[PDB]
Write a protein that binds this ligand. Structure first.
Ligand SMILES: [Mg+2]
Ligand SMILES: [Mg+2]
Ligand SMILES: [Mg+2]
Ligand SMILES: [Mg+2]
Ligand SMILES: [Mg+2]
Ligand SMILES: [Mg+2]
Ligand SMILES: [Mg+2]
Ligand SMILES: [Mg+2]
Ligand SMILES: [Mg+2]
Ligand SMILES: [Mg+2]
Ligand SMILES: [Mg+2]
Ligand SMILES: [Mg+2]
Ligand SMILES: [Mg+2]
Ligand SMILES: [Mg+2]
Ligand SMILES: [Mg+2]
Ligand SMILES: [Mg+2]
Ligand SMILES: [Mg+2]
Ligand SMILES: [Mg+2]
Ligand SMILES: [Mg+2]
Ligand SMILES: [Mg+2]
Ligand SMILES: [Mg+2]
Ligand SMILES: [Mg+2]
Ligand SMILES: [Mg+2]
Ligand SMILES: [Mg+2]
Ligand SMILES: [Mg+2]
Ligand SMILES: [Mg+2]
Ligand SMILES: [Mg+2]
Ligand SMILES: [Zn+2]
Lengths: 88, 146, 81, 52, 50
RNA sequence: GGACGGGGAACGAGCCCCCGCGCCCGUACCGAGAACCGACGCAGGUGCUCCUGGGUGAGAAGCCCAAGGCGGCUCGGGUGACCCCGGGCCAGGGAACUCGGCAAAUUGGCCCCGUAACUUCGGGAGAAGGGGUGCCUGCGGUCUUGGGGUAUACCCCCGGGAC
RNA sequence: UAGUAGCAGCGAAGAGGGGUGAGAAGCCCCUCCGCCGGAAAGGACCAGGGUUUCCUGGCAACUUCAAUAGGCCAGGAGUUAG
RNA sequence: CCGUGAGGGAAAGCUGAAAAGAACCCCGGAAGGGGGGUGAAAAGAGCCUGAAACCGGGCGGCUACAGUGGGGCAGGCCCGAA
RNA sequence: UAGGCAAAGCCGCCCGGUGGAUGGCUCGGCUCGGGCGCCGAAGAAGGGCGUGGCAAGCUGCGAUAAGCCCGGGGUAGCCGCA
C-alpha cells in the first residue's frame, strides 16, 4: 500500500570487504550497503530495508566470500523509508 | 508455550524440521493444548519439512565404474583389502567338495583321492582349474572332468 | 484419614474422563484402608486405588469408582466443586 | 592433582548420613555409628568434657 | 537421585515447604520489620546436607 | 527341577474352562563447557558410564553429510600503526645458530624388488636402498550368493556381491 | 589507581524480513549462512543435586554486555505399577 | 552459614504524641520527579541525632617562564554580624 | 607592563550526596547475695516431621496439633512475637 516516490539503480562496489577480517565479510557487506544507500538517498542507515534476494546474494558463498559488487534497485517510499533489492 | 515442542511430538518429527507459518503469528499466543496445535496442523499453518536423505546418484554412478575395473589402482589402496585367511577357507572348500564328490560318485579311487586331498592341503594347486588340468593330464579319472 | 479433595485441572479431567476422585490422605494410609474409607463414607464401590507421595510429603490417591457410580456426581454431592 | 581436580570426585559418595537419634549429618554408614552422639555403638549419649 | 529412600524424601519435602519468604501481609503487619526468612535458600547455592 | 523312599485319604490333577487376591517405598527434571564437586552460570574433575546412519578409508582415524540438535564453550562495532599470541611463504647458502639442531623442516599409506655388522639364532628388520601409484576405454581371472537347466560338486544360462 | 585491566586464545557465526513491546542486533516466526554427527554437541541413564520440571505473569536484584529472555522472581500445578 | 566429620559460627537495635503512613493535579515504561498536603518538627517508612574519610556543585584566592611542604617578616585580593 | 581573562590542576569555607561516627535511649548482658533442687519403661531429656483462613522463621502445641475439659482468680474484651 506504500507508494514509491523515487527509483534508482546503483552498482555498489564491495571491494572494501576484501580489506577487513575474513571472519566477518558477509556481515560487513550488509553494513556497506546500508551506508551507501543512506548516503545516496539522504536517509539514516536504519531506514534502509534490504530485500531477501539481496541478503541471499551476499551470503551465497558463506561469511567469507561476499560478491565483489552488487547491482541493486533502490526505491524510496512516500513515508521516507528506502527499499534496496537485488536487480534481477 | 513453545508451540514447536508440541508440534514436533504431534507430527512425530524433530523440532529441527517443524515449520510454523508466519501468517499464524497472531494465533501462537493463544495455543494452550496439544489439540490447539492439532487445529493449526489441520489448517496447514504448521507442517513438517521433509527430511534430507543423502543422495546416492553420484555413488551409484561410481559403483558401476568400480565394477568395470576403475578407480582401484595402486594409488587408491591404503590398507589390506584381501583377507588371506578367508581365501584359504574358500580354496579348501572349493577343492575338497569337488574331490569328495568325485570319490562319492566312484570316479576317483580312495588311494588317488587321498593323494590329491593331501596335495590340495599342501598348497600344490593354485585353483580349481589347475586341479582339473592335473586330473585330466594324469588320467586320474576314467573320463575327463569338465 | 481423608484430609481434602484435589480439584485441580488434572484432577477434574480424571473425574470426567476416567471416573476417578483424587484425595489427600494421611501419609501412612494404605490402598486397602483408602478403599475401605471411601466406600464407608460415600457408599460407592471402588474399582482400584493408585497412590503416590507428592514432593511436599503428602499422600495422594487416585481412586477409580466402579461402573455404577459417578465421580463427578459424588464431588457435586459433597459440595467440594 | 590433589586440589581442584580431586575435588571433582567428592560429587557422588558419602561417609555420613543423618543420624536418627541426634539429627546431625554424622552417622558413619560404614562404621554403623554416629560420630556426634554415638548412636549405634553407645546407648549413652556421646559428649566429652574437652568440648565446650 | 532417581531411587530415593522415603526418609530422605521427607526431609527434602520439609526443606521445600519451608523455602519461601514471609507473605506480603506479614511485611505490612510488622511495619516492614519482617521481610526475610532464614529458611529461604536457593537450590544452587545453599546446599542441604540431606 | 528331578529322582528315590516312607505315611495317609477316596478321590482327583502339570491338561481345558471359570472365579478371586496381589501390601509397602521409588517414579518430576538435570544427569553436566550453566541443574553434581571444585567459594562461580569455573576450559578442571565426575561419566564418554552405555549406544550411534551414509561417502571415502585398514579403521569406532581424519574429512564431508544425515537422523537429531546447536549458533549460550553467553560482549557488540570500527580501524587495519607498532608490539604480542597462534599460523603461511621466503632467493643464495645449509647448523656458519646454540650449552645442545631447542624449535622447525625432512620422511610418511599401500604394492613390488631388496636389506648389513652383530646375535642370547628368537632377533637385528619397516634395517638401509631402488621402483610403482590419477583418470578413461576395453578384455580377463579367483571366489561368493540365489534362481533356472537331468542337475545337490563340476559344466551352461540369468540376477546380485567381494577381491 | 581508573571509566583503566579483563569480558580474545582451548578449530561454530552470524544475516534479512516480519511480530511483540515504552524501548529490540540479541525475545517469537520464516528465509539465508554456518557447527556437531562413534559427539566439549545426538540417544539413554547411575550417584549426587532437590523442584532446578510444567503453566501464567514479571524485570528491583541475579546472568562478565543487552533483554520484553531465563536454571532468576511471584502465583499456580505436576511424579499413579502384582 | 562453614567443614566428610570430630567440630566451628556471624552480621543485624531507635518514624512520630498520634499514621495524622503523604489525599488530589501534571510528567514518566517504571523505580520515581514536580506541584500540593500531614505534623511542633519530614522525623517519609532506605524513618532520632547524622561526624570524618570520600565525591559533586557554588563561592574566595592561585593558575600555562618557573621546582612544590612548614615558620617569620612585608604586601595583594577576599571575609571580618555575634 | 600589569587588568578585562578563563586550560588541566591546588588550597579553604558553604551546600548536597555517600557513610554511619557521636550523643541520648535500653524489655539485653555481667557480677554478687538469697532460695530451691532431681527427671525416666505410667516410655524421659534430645531430635525429626507436622500444626494457623491468608503463615516462611521464632514461640507454643501433637492428627483433639498458637490448642480440648474441670475448678479457682479475672470482667469485657479476645484470636502469641506481629
Ligand atoms: Mg581418488
Ligand atoms: Mg596366517
Ligand atoms: Mg507407587
Ligand atoms: Mg593431601
Ligand atoms: Mg567409604
Ligand atoms: Mg554446586
Ligand atoms: Mg522420567
Ligand atoms: Mg560458562
Ligand atoms: Mg537435521
Ligand atoms: Mg572486540
Ligand atoms: Mg630459503
Ligand atoms: Mg657451531
Ligand atoms: Mg657461535
Ligand atoms: Mg625437535
Ligand atoms: Mg583490553
Ligand atoms: Mg570441524
Ligand atoms: Mg555469540
Ligand atoms: Mg561439518
Ligand atoms: Mg569418526
Ligand atoms: Mg550426551
Ligand atoms: Mg523451565
Ligand atoms: Mg515461563
Ligand atoms: Mg525460584
Ligand atoms: Mg536521620
Ligand atoms: Mg565583629
Ligand atoms: Mg580550570
Ligand atoms: Mg520432645
Ligand atoms: Zn547421632
Amino acid at each position: 500500500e506504500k507508494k514509491v516516490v523515487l527509483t534508482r539503480e546503483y552498482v555498489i562496489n564491495l571491494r572494501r570487504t576484501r580489506e577487513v577480517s575474513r571472519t566477518k565479510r558477509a556481515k560487513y557487506a550488509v553494513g556497506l550497503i546500508r551506508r551507501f544507500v543512506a548516503r545516496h538517498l539522504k536517509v539514516e542507515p536504519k531506514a534502509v530495508k534490504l530485500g531477501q534476494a539481496l541478503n541471499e546474494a551476499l551470503w551465497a558463498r558463506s561469511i567469507e566470500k561476499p560478491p565483489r559488487r552488487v547491482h541493486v534497485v533502490v526505491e524510496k517510499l512516500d513515508d521516507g523509508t528506502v527499499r534496496v533489492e537485488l536487480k534481477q | 508455550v513453545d508451540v514447536k515442542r508440541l508440534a514436533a511430538e504431534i507430527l512425530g518429527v524433530g523440532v529441527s524440521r517443524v515449520k510454523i507459518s508466519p501468517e499464524a503469528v497472531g494465533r501462537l499466543e493463544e495455543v494452550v493444548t496439544k489439540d490447539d496445535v492439532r487445529a493449526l496442523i489441520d489448517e496447514g499453518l504448521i507442517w513438517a519439512e521433509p527430511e534430507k536423505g543423502n543422495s546416492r546418484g553420484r555413488w551409484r554412478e561410481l559403483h558401476e565404474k568400480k565394477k568395470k575395473g576403475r578407480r582401484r589402482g595402486q594409488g587408491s589402496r591404503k590398507g589390506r583389502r584381501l583377507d588371506e585367511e578367508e581365501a584359504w577357507v574358500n580354496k579348501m572348500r572349493v577343492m575338497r567338495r569337488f574331490l569328495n564328490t568325485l570319490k562319492r560318485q566312484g570316479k576317483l579311487d580312495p588311494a588317488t583321492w587321498r593323494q590329491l586331498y593331501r596335495m590340495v592341503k599342501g598348497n600344490y594347486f593354485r585353483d580349481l582349474r589347475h586341479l582339473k588340468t592335473y586330473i585330466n593330464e594324469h588320467k586320474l579319472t576314467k573320463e575327463p572332468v569338465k | 484419614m481423608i484430609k481434602r479433595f484435589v480439584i485441580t485441572e488434572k484432577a477434574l479431567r480424571l473425574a470426567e474422563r476416567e471416573n476417578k476422585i483424587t484425595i489427600i490422605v494421611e501419609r501412612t494410609a494404605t490402598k486397602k484402608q483408602i478403599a475401605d474409607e471411601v466406600q464407608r463414607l460415600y457408599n460407592v464401590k471402588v474399582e482400584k486405588v493408585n497412590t503416590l507421595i507428592t514432593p511436599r510429603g503428602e499422600k495422594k490417591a487416585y481412586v477409580k469408582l466402579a461402573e455404577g457410580y459417578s465421580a463427578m456426581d459424588l464431588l457435586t454431592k459433597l459440595g467440594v466443586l | 592433582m590433589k586440589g581442584t581436580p580431586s575435588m571433582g570426585k567428592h560429587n557422588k559418595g558419602k561417609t555420613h548420613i543423618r543420624c536418627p537419634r541426634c539429627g546431625r549429618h554424622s552417622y558413619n554408614v560404614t562404621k554403623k555409628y554416629c560420630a556426634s552422639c554415638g548412636w549405634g555403638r553407645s546407648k549413652r549419649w556421646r559428649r566429652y568434657n574437652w568440648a565446650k | 537421585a532417581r531411587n530415593k529412600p522415603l526418609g530422605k524424601k521427607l526431609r527434602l519435602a520439609a526443606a521445600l515447604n519451608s523455602n519461601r519468604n514471609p507473605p506480603l501481609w506479614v511485611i505490612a503487619k510488622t511495619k516492614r520489620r519482617v521481610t526475610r526468612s532464614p529458611a529461604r535458600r536457593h537450590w544452587r547455592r545453599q546446599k542441604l546436607k540431606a
